[PDB]
């Protein structure tokens, strides 16, 4: 039973992306697009395992501080310019240049690249970053501490190279469909805002000979019910990674074989704005954590396999085993609620004068459902001391508000950028460009800093447990659950495994079968 003649595929990408410039974004819809059009030093297969990308080989010194990548001598951007180490140097410098204002600027600081933090903090020029083109096809990364998991970091959207010649000549107009040049398996055929992105084969991709899918469309359907309806109508082949909890038990039995649920390294949270009154009060942040019943959300609201959590890092992640769930999470709800009430009353709330705020979330009926549940539990568990409004915003507008800090409480999902605990731990550093909570605690920073010169797993895992303990005591955010990624995938679509813990979809890993 063979390959189809056609090889077209339609996939829900869930929202209109903020941008196709991998230095201007931090979201999953954006990265999904970037990963089709560009390819970093290394990439991954259907199960998250690492394989050669722009680098055909690489090595490290025994101290894990020097990483040397050998680029393909004949590889070309999609316009035919050579892909060189200079492109990687150019791009990684741009990531950290403060003038670029990248949300992921801090990513190279996570990798411990020499001078990355100082460049971000404005103390050194971008050109002083500890990466170099030793020649045109040798890119070398120099780190100040050992980073044995460094190769796996290089897969991230923020470390994608850019076509220097083009970006320098065209400025940020480079991102327009008419000018976009890239080195991934696909190239932009069309972009209609709030409707579709169309991809076509990049025949100058080094590995075009292995790409099967010829064209693809990304839809931007925000609501999972609409997603499922289109799928059933046969107008899309894979949903995005949310499904209606109402239809879910049915879909599983009726579309047996088509329902995938990947266990992913992700945490769903309500992020509290730690520098806006009244969430700058730890007592109030503690009350909210105490009075929210996680099992209500994972069991009655969703019921898809999501598991309740009271910490940020998924504990099943590599080197997360020592992370402990906090003690309040084991007390009866009635005792937790009594304590919450006490705290809110001590802070001057009553039924007549309750704690009023809004939950900001991106338009999406599953998030709305969780927001209603949370608002509901918060009013009732505190006997009227909390009163929550809901503020849905479009994806781009929601991302913009979180980043500008124009919010009280915001829905937040963090998905691992690499399968090692620090991809979470690093989020909450005072100076992390990713930290839209504005959580800042010198002792957290110190705990994470001292993980970075531990020379075995155990030592690192202890630091992460301490960091997670400090963030927990500060009640910096409201963690809720660890993700499963429920998706519907047509039976004629192959190459999607359901075993990738970052649940990436690379069009080059798929193919359509006949019969």
Automatic annotation (TrEMBL):
GO terms under cellular component: ATP-binding cassette (ABC) transporter complex; outer membrane-bounded periplasmic space
Superkingdom, taxonomy of origin: Bacteria
Matches recorded under InterPro entries: Peptide/Ni-bd, SBP_5, SBP_5_CS, SBP_5_dom
Main localization, broad class: other
Coiled-coil region: none
Molecular functions per Gene Ontology: peptide transmembrane transporter activity
Keyword Cell wall biogenesis/degradation: no
Subcellular locations according to the entry: Cell envelope
Location of the Solute-binding protein family domain: 49-435
CDD domains in the cross-refs: PBP2_OppA (cd08504)
Assigned keywords, A-Z: Signal, Transport
Biological process, per Gene Ontology: peptide transport
Membership in a protein family: Belongs to the bacterial solute-binding protein 5 family.
Protein known as: Periplasmic oligopeptide-binding protein
